[model samples]
Target: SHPWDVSRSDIYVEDRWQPIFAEMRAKAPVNRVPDSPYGAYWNVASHKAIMHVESLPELFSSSWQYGGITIGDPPEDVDPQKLAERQLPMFIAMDRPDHTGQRRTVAPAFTPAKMVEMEAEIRRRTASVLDSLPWGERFDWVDKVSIELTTGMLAILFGFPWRLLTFWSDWAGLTLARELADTRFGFLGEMAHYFQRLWGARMQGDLISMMIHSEAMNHMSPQEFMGNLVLLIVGGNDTTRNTMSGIVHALDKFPDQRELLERDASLIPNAVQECIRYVTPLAHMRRTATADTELFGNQIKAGEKVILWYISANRDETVFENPDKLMVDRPNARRHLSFGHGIHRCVGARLAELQLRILLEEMHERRMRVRVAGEVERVRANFVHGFRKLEVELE
Candidate 1:
């Protein structure tokens, strides 16, 4: 019954969702519910059932057949031409050949060799930000640290002005939320204007410019380029920022984990993985059933929505030992579904991990201790789970 009600806010937080999901999982791993805001759909809560859908993208398509990737139906107001104009063939929204090909275009940028070249710079930029923070003072770690790290990396990657990076990042986060909320497009128009300017200057050997000029994407129209850019911004910003916020929040709540991380600096990367596992940002992603299928005895009709609860899967008691506990040395800590699973898994996942690792290293080196200075709040929407405001004392 709780799963049937889409209005519940507890669905967003792992701490809140785990108990509710336990009840749901026990009742039925896959249960159909009617009368929903996003329209009637089946909620897939069990780890195996969710993975079945993700691994078989062909059986459960990401394209229009399943109503795009979000749970429920794709917004009726979405204009095909507008999506087409943006040349938005985001890999997440594509299937098979197209998804594979489009993903290939930018995959090279995140390869080990490329990331190795960028790692030093990421560390440098992260340190610079940490150094800028005044000692014995309070600040919102989300704004002061998390956002700055990811935005700086994104700006450098796209070769955009660092000054304007925050504006675009904020706009991009809000735009993704708007898409999830099924609201009228908010920043898409302004984002197009911003990208046009960046597109003009993108010929200088950066990711955006390379994407524009590359043989792989040369035939792409401006609309396609805009769509791809939107994908990149959302990919580069939200996931990493949420991970960073998760780290700070986890550290604050579990001081021993913080002490353990501080004592053994080598565990920073592992700790980052733990944070991702603990927070499990971005909630669930939807898939469309290509044909009638039975999952855990629940019949899924062709074209029916199959929502994968990544947040629930990560906390699955069967998969994760001591599912709710945060262990920095978690052997399978990286096994979390925060970035998702199977062929359509997040392409920028490694980049996100690298950025967060560098951020934590820098923050730790500076002995940054973030204490809540006010009542911290999270974004209202369940789609993009993160802090709306987290005022803190960075002492």
Candidate 2:
């Protein structure tokens, strides 16, 4: 009922959100905030509760009409009638039939078969980027490796690398509500220009090309196409990029885990999962209740906001042995919700993992050890949890 609004950027930027969430996990795993700047919602802060909400996708909707999948909605003051005019129809924010059609379209692109097909290109791009890094000198890892590697894959898949102008302001938790209209295109506008250029221009065997020629293109209306295109770019770009930063940041933070790699190179795969758990690229995903239902003994009314804190859930003590510590060989690391769970699981997950696996594997070959040297700057947003600028020097 009070201000335990984890949406505030300070908690994330300072890296002190652990205890606040731990308090909720201990006392109230699914506690409701009846009032806050972000309006009333339930903070689903544990492993089980989040999976419970995600499992029942029908009742708990990710549709944009109900504020979409972030800790944000149309804002308590905005008129509901203008909602459709403002938002883009991303499938990750759609429920059931709508979601299924759109998801199926993108699904073929990242299939296990597709991953096998794309593996060589990813490893080649990644290994070359790893080779091109400044030797024995300081550089922004986020730029040098993380962004470069990630953008290449997404550019190959989605057609370009992009960063929205004022979107960063909204993400930084610094904004004037008026800026919401012009700047927020559901992350669609930038990619719209990209797609406009690439229209009828196919990049053979590419995800965008597949979507263009397939049933998915026919299934999506123009706005829907724009919306989900934004999804592919953001989903593919954000998750992999942040996790890449997380890999370097975590391995350096937990030198013991790096030593584990030095000792037994077999630990690389599990280390990727373990570090992904540690730095859950996106902090939380918001879901809206479609029906009034009881969740874990808590009475959740219809139209309530449900924030699934994946960051907290990954460190859930019940599942993960030493939840905070990065154990490169943690047996159950695969259970982490980094790519999320259920029908809404990340479409590019295997592809992202392929990219990450190659990054680590190539680093192993080069004996590259990235140490956090000059400064550490974390992305100051509850939605996208990552580094803005990570300064490091290779050893």
Candidate 3:
């Protein structure tokens, strides 16, 4: 058995158990689970502990040395050829020097000034998707709205032609879901081929194009390019899509909070931060210990995996008051770990927030009312916990 078996449906069903996490925080902030097939890891379940680990990239690196921000180790059965083909140091998976250089190549495109320029287009795209919806009909919000808006924005960022962008984005999202579940080499292989074609077409200033042309990444092999593409597509798609879904779902559960926004509408940006905190979409990102060290009184062995449950940490009682509840003006709303912390923090955090804020603002401007049509169904993987299907009636 694992320290936290998310593979179990029941545990997921009972998501927020303060007592269980409190005990985890108190007794085993860095404890090991004996006799587990997935191998042992230090579960940093407390907000304070996670922030500590995140703030010290020197001790808890994001490099492959720390298992590349995922729990346990990479699966034992990953195809060797595939592994070699996909092992490049993308910005998010890197530490120092190369990470800094690679990150610099594209950081300007997402700066506050740049994001403001992009905001109008982002709002227009969101409205187009919402406008196309058949009024008063029920549809899966993830498919019908969230994915459409995020993918459209991604296509703009990538500078892909509009007609083919939707296909690429859908494939990219599906490929990531399959990859995360450890079940789709065929999908990944196809994605690799797509990236090769995409990389071949680059001559301009888009992120992928820039990566394709840069001297820093030029020496990278095709496999390296493919791996980096996988990273970007996942990074681009998952967090924004999940946060958008989280906003709607949280509002459904907390109608009074929804009413507060419906009444004033100026609170959308604050609500966006709150939704990211409440959803904590990326859940737990994994890190590996470089050397044996002590944290929260437990000794973490060298090379041991460290699981930072950001979802749990965002709700930690030590940090947020009424941790289980959603509050738009929660004093430290921006302090949540949804975008992570330190040097390895999310590169596209500002862009993601901009997109989410615009989407909410446009919905309110149109006086759109969304009601849940059926139970929301979350994706099964712990790594990307958002709705796979969320039926909604938009009025």
Candidate 4:
């Protein structure tokens, strides 16, 4: 555990990545780091070795020609086809028959009857952003209720005419709105001319017109049709807007699991699977070992670099008995891997748990509550964990 480098982004901006992945899940749960800064990797970290390297998808390989899903690669003196003529190779960095026919062509806009027909427009934009919060002053619940409820569900399911992004960065605020639209419409070319004039007005029940008229957008290759439409706008805006600011900063840092979710609202759908397993949002996901296996006994040779930390396997304490608190009613909180396991799990995980169980059932039907009242700011980035400004207040 060579001075345990959980690929430090200063230990997730000093929230101290839980005692450095709990000392590599108590002494090397498949450790190896030949050298850091996202190089020679392999830190699967417990919870049964990250579902044993995600149930062996072709012996660990979420490939983008080896080095995708995260732990950054692609800098071997650049020019990988001039960086694939302006990046966009989505399909969660392919494997399995081109990630199984481009994830069965946008898996019909996140089914379950399309998240029960987008749950009444995601509960009327989480009750108009929690009834336009401002109860006790102090704000920035990651920019007014987790980036305007996931950029207003990405301007209502990627009907993206550029309205909701009116500031305060959510899914890492589209990298600061493409550096303020490439410094006033120049570089990434005015966010590609308002994303090709909002993909030439394709709104018919959005989700990009159900993935450009399905059949998985027929063998896509216009650079994977602009990298699968920025991979459904960075997976529907960063795992449901960083688990909706990690369910109000993990119920204001576990105030008895926010008084057991305000004294049981039928434990808000297992507290939205225990706040997405205590906010494991989108942490580690790189995988590339391709053969030479032999895991738990560790030898993982061929091509190496296996990352998959799913934020240290959801605080892995041997299949989570008390793996780092936040247990709203534990009993295997939907056995979370923070949505990433077999066949590349999380095709908008039931539309991100139906927009975080309708944002904690419309904030407990507006009986409302939230606290982290002054600066929390995590997300320094070791691949989008979450929150870049929490600062709450509502009581």
The prediction achieving the highest TM-score against the true structure is: 2
The total number of steric clashes, by the backbone 3 Å criterion, in model 4 comes to 1
- Residue-pair clashes per candidate, as listed? 6, 1, 3, 1
Give lDDT for model 2: 0.80
Which residue pairs collide in model 2, if any? 62-93
lDDT score of model 3? 0.74
TM-score of 3: 0.90
What TM-score, to 2 decimals, does candidate 1 have?
0.89
Assess each prediction's global lDDT (C-alpha) against the native.
Answer: 0.73, 0.80, 0.74, 0.73
lDDT of residue 157 for candidate 2: 71
User: Model 4: runs farther than 4 Å from truth?
Assistant: 1-28, 31-43, 46-63, 67-148, 156-221, 228-234, 241-255, 260-277, 282-284, 289-299, 304-307, 311-322, 327-366, 369-395
Off by over 4 Å in 2: 75-84, 159-177, 184-190
lDDT, candidate 3, 31-140, per-residue tens: 66544434666667888888899887767877864557665454455567645343444567677877888777777788899987888888878888878887787888
For residues 253-365, write the lDDT of model 1, one tens digit per residue: 88888888878889988888888888877878888888998777778898787788787788787788898888888888877888888888888888888888888877877
RMSD of 3: 3.2
Tell me how far the alpha carbon of residue 260 in candidate 3 is from the true structure, in angstroms, after superposition: 0.5
Worst 10 residues of 1 by lDDT: 174-183
Report the C-alpha lDDT of model 2 over 1-395, residue by residue, as the tens digit: 66567888889999999998888888988989977768788999999888888998889999987878887765535556555455567889899887887788778878898888888988898888889888789989887888788767876775544423223222322332656665555444664666767765653356676677767465566677776766776787767778998888898889988987987888887888888899999889989999889998999999999999998899899898878888889999999998889999887778877888888998989888889998889887888898888999987
Lowest summed lDDT across 10 adjacent residues in model 2 is found at 165-174
TM-score of each: 0.89, 0.92, 0.90, 0.35
Q: What lDDT tens digits, residue by residue, belong to model 4 across residues 264-298?
A: 88878888888887888777788888878689888
- Deviation in angstroms for 354 in model 1? 1.1
